[PDB]
C-alpha cells in the first residue's frame, strides 16, 4: 500500500520515498546525483571537487558536488561514524 523505495549497498545507507544521495563514479572523475523517484533513481553525472574541510577523519576524505550542497564521505580502515572517530579495531 505505502511506498518507500531506493536503498543503497555501496554506501550502505537506506533512502525513503523522494530522497537523494551521491554515487561517486570510478576512474572518470565525476559523480551522479541519484534522487529517488518512485523507484526510478534519477541519477546523472556532475562535476565534483574536494569539500572545504575534511569532514572524514582517520584517513577518510570528503567530496562535495560543484553545484549542489550534497556531499559524500569516504573513510577506509573499517572504523565507524561519519568522522570515523569510533575505532574498534585498534585500541
Swiss-Prot record:
Coiled-coil features, chain-numbered ranges: none
Source organism superkingdom: Eukaryota
Name of the featured protein: Tissue-type plasminogen activator chain A
Residues of the full protein shown: 36 to 126 of 562
Site positions for Important for binding to LRP1: 67
Disulphide-bonded residues: 6-36, 34-43, 51-62, 56-73, 75-84
Transmembrane stretches, start-end: none
All residue ranges annotated as the EGF-like domain in the record: 47-85
Region feature Important for binding to annexin A2, mapped onto this chain: 7-17
Ranges where the Fibronectin type-I domain occurs: 4-46
Residues bearing carbohydrate: 61
Amino acid at each position: 500500500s505505502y511506498q518507500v523505495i531506493c536503498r543503497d549497498e555501496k554506501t550502505q545507507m537506506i533512502y525513503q520515498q523522494h530522497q537523494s544521495w551521491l554515487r561517486p563514479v570510478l576512474r572518470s572523475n565525476r559523480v551522479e546525483y541519484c534522487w529517488c523517484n518512485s523507484g526510478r533513481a534519477q541519477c546523472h553525472s556532475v562535476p565534483v571537487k574536494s569539500c572545504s574541510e575534511p569532514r572524514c577523519f582517520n584517513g577518510g576524505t570528503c567530496q562535495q558536488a560543484l553545484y549542489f550542497s550534497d556531499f559524500v564521505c569516504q573513510c577506509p580502515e573499517g572504523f565507524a561514524g561519519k568522522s570515523c572517530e569510533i575505532d574498534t579495531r585498534a585500541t
